Amino acid sequence: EITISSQTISEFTHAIGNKCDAFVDRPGKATLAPMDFAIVIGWKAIIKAIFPKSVDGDLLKLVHLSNGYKMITGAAPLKKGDVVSTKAEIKAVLNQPSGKLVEVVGTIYREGKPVMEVTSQFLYRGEYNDYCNTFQKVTETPVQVAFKSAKDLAVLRSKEWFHLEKDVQFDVLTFRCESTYKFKSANVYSSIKTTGQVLLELPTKEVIQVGSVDYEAGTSYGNPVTDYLSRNGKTIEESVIFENAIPLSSGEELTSKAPGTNEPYAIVSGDYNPIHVSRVFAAYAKLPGTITHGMYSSASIRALVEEWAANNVAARVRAFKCDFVGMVLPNDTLQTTMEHVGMINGRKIIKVETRNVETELPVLIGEAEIEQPTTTYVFTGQGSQEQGMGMELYNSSEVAREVWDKADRHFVNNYGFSILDIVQNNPNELTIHFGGAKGRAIRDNYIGMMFETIGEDGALKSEKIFKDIDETTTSYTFVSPTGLLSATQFTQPALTLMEKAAYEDIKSKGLIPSDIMFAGHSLGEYSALSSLANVMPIESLVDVVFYRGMTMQVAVPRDELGRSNYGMVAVNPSRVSATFDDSALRFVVDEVANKTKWLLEIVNYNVENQQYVAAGDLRALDTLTNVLNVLKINKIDIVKLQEQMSIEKVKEHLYEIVDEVAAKSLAKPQPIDLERGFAVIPLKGISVPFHSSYLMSGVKPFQRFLCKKIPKSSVKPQDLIGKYIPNLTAKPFELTKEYFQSVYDLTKSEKIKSILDNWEQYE
Amino acid sequence: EQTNSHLPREKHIAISLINGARNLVLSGPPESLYGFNLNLRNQKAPMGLDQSRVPFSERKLKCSNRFLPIFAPFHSHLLADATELILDDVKEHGLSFEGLKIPVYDTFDGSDFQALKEPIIDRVVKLITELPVHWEEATNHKATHILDFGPGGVSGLGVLTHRNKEGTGA
Amino acid sequence: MKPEIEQELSHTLLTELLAYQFASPVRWIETQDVFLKQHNTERIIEIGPSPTLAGMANRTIKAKYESYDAALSLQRQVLCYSKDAKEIYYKPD
């Protein structure tokens, strides 16, 4: 157990020249420790693994070849209060033609939990025939085998190393496997033990193990388990490499310089190898002098990539590995290059080469994984549909093509249309035909889709609205004069398919951070938690977003023309007056709904003082567009009437204003076409005031539909908590008792107020 | 007050050197002084804006600001912990200043060092590290010729104290 | 909380949030005041057909967080999938 003191950090960073301000002690910030201080913590655990008798070598010809760091995903960096211990295990002692390789992986613990792994790699140079005392432990690459024919299930049940322990049908299997080899000659094996777990991805995103691998053999020439997976499946590749690697910084900027003597770094890190410090030990092994520590060139180049690639943010670099390809004498000048090549799990693969500038020979070849900047994803709602959404992203991306193709054949087999031809070749009307045997299996989907809306009178009008599809109907026609892709129940499945096509294409390229905060506006909400929280499949997402489109559309009564007395209006409060506040217009909406006993609510709280959207019946919308016109010419600010008039008498002040425009609102033909105002842009194409209390009655069938389309086991909470910003409660998703009350005070829910009462059974 | 409102008090910015009426030097952390001149670039104007055809009171403010080659936050609260450490080293060695002969004006107060209750060195270390500089208060002259022995020459103290005393006969 | 409990508390809350999102006003202002201020996000990436949220982000930065981004030295990069596609895929021109 070593305790990371404040003095041990500052002596270490001075020895390696790490300038970065996160490591020096400043008030108002917890003093952070270097990630190269891992080897100071874990030296006496790593080099104890080359002392056993079974690894018997000339220790004075040892060459430190490569070392690597890896932060565990979800672990915090080291602090100055941390009590830190280390357990190390040895992985591979294998006799090569160039010597006896020793790889030691030392996992550093802290308060029980592991923090980071140190993958060090040594070499006893020479020729060694000790094949009796050599071994190798490798964790194999996860191979995803995709079963498509019917003979494929027959093959692996003949493989005696496979043993499935369940009667579960399976489409695709990922084998996450580990091996333990023992050698008998240079490339024959004395024994192989290969165990591993096989895995199945369910459609509800739950991972359940199907069976196990148990292979064991003696005197072999290869591993059968891996060679089977080498040809009959693809590897789960996470290191996705770019087509053309981009250089991060160019010029001479990059140089670094060796120390004058190796004695400061030796006493700090405990690296007391006399090759680095002594004239006589370095001359004994015929190496060119008192050469630099490898661990200095680890910490020096890592401090270069921490400031020149991570913009001097110390938390971003999460993995760093290098090969000590050459040796460097002291005071040599090192010019490094730094190149951005690939991605993995949202963090940036960066590859570096350190070259001695007066010789131009390579010394280090390395690689680093740094985080991206703090990224958040917003998803576009409805309003921005156009013909041709992402068809270049459909024609050119594999992973985006399989989410359109999987979804339209869920529409054409269950609802009778193709969503690709709705997006590509936008029609003005679509006839759904209820044809033969599978066509009568499609119209009873439409019969079962029944919404219930109780009226304001309290009488439950359990009535049939679909007279238009019944047991004798053979065709139904969807009509929209603007275009079907602009019609409500077809515009929103076109978006969430397009936005998941762009997401899963972005996700397949390794672009998704783990510390992301994602969101969506109105319709985007679903496009978010299906993307990042994967709570519903591709087929169950498109049902909900289509059911929501028909839930909102026929929730508003239409006339014989199919038009309505309702609508929505986008409001810019900046255009009426520069002193027209947020509390100015939302006071206007507050009183005019209370006076006329209508419904008028601002439903989109988009931008402070620039973009609001008001919704309600059109008489209140012709009211609001005329009030904000007449308050532009009269220059009446309400907040300046707060010091001029009392609190109550502003309620009697509005009768001189709003009653004149409310009378002329009813003097127009009642289903009005709204004109453009000064501070008012009416949303052309909309007819339902959603996100308002009018649609509060229509939730209860839609709330029953989510309880069978969002299954209980698909909710992974770790992608929801603190990363999901809802639109009901616009502070981030958290399952605390104060959060449920903020939901319940805003909607008066029934299901959460049950669990808000008996809250105490949580722990 | 615009910049320090978004920052803690360990990254708070204060006035350090007052070199004139329109010559000031700010001090603080280098990142929060970089937070200062990003704000100023929003409200400043380039030098070639040509405001000669807009009237005077509706013009925009123009300035030149850049970091000095100085590698410590002198004359601020950032080094107030160092002041107790320095005069401890003054006590450990034979550092003391004897009887003064010409009046030497204080930089912060503007008083003479001959009339001190305190010693001079533990006053001046509070005066370089912590307390700010009121320079035109400190050179409130009765003087005809002024000699800068200091660094810079044509860029030194003498040129910036020239412009404060252009018509006072110095 | 036990892992069987903390799903069921999150399962009901995720459904009651989405179902009542249909009928309650979307509060995108203090939504924007989370991922601009409480999280300090540099990359704001819109995925959609047209930048109606990238332009909705830029108007909130200049109105509420211009003196905030200067003081804490954040360089926020606004991005959309409509126009700024070469910046997201790290294939720069």
Author numbering:
A (entry chain B): 1275 to 2037
B (entry chain B): 341 to 510
C (entry chain A): 1 to 93
What does the paper say about this structure?
In the Apo state, ACP density is strongest in proximity of the KS domain in S. cerevisiae FAS and allows for a complete tracing of its backbone atoms in the high resolution cryoEM map. In the Apo state of C. albicans (62 and 69% identity for β- and α-chains, relative to their respective S. cerevisiae chains), the ACP density is strongest in proximity of the ER domain, similarly allowing for complete tracing of the backbone atoms of this mobile domain at an alternate location. However, the negative surface charge on KS domain is weakened in C. albicans due to alteration of some of the acidic residues that form the interface with the structural lobe of ACP. Weaker charge complementarity can partly explain why in this pathogenic fungal species, ACP is not primarily localized at the KS in the Apo state. Interestingly, unlike the KS-binding site where both canonical and structural lobes of ACP contribute to the surface area of the binding interface, the interface of ACP at the ER mainly involves the canonical lobe. This observation can explain the worse local resolution seen for the ACP of C. albicans localized at the ER compared to that in S. cerevisiae at the KS domain in the Apo states. In the Apo state of C. albicans FAS, the second strongest density is in proximity of the KS domain that is only observable at lower resolution and threshold of the AAI cryoEM density map. In both FASs in the Apo state, the structural lobe of ACP has stronger and better resolved densities compared to the canonical lobe in the KS-binding site, as observed in the high-resolution refined maps, suggesting a more stable interaction between the former and the KS-domain in the absence of substrates. Examining the ER active site in C. albicans Apo state where ACP is partially bound, we can clearly see the density of the phosphopantetheine arm until the quaternary carbon atom of the moiety. Interestingly, the catalytic histidine can be modeled with two side chain orientations, one facing FMN and the other facing the phosphate group of the phosphopantetheine arm. Based on these structures, the catalytic histidine in the ER domain of type I fungal FAS may sample alternative conformations to form a proton transfer bridge between FMN and the enoyl functional group of the elongating fatty acid chain when ACP is bound.
